[PDB]
Amino acid sequence: PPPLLVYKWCQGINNLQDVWETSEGECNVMLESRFEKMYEKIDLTLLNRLLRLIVDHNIADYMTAKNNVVINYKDMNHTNSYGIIRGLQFASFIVQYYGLVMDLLVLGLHR
Amino acid sequence: TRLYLKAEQERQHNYLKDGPYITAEEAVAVYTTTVHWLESRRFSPIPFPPLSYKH
């Protein structure tokens, strides 16, 4: 559960090699942030190209093909072409894989 | 709800009008980055379930 995540994060902050020693001018930095518009700024063609590495290509074509459909509200019809449909079943995979691509950009490959 | 629908229908047509907002070089960068990461871990791709996966 997420409070156990918080508890293990606090234990990981505690158990580093000499983490609270500041006799020689060391510093600790805690960044917390949010990826703004992560759900709306996923291009579907780039998503298909990144998705064909891990599954069969018909599966990736089915996952990309569901996102390109018409959304309706009672009088209003418009097609979707940019950003994923977040309310799908399998969309819980799509956010977790694409955000993995962010970890290769932030954290670096070596680290 | 109608105002947000008018905003979404406008921004999708703006994406269709202005072209893709991503460049090719950044796409090649993230694609080769994903290729190097998945080849560094020896990831085997997920197969299609043929006739009877027994799960």
Binding site: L44 | L16, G19
Partner: peptide
């Protein structure tokens, strides 16, 4: 196989997609 090429696209948008995504 046989890449997706979204339902939708106009002429120049298809040209830009074929340019940057191939």
């Amino acid at each position: 196989v046989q890449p997706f090429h979204l339902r939708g696209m106009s002429s120049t948008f298809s040209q830009r997609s074929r340019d940057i995504f191939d």
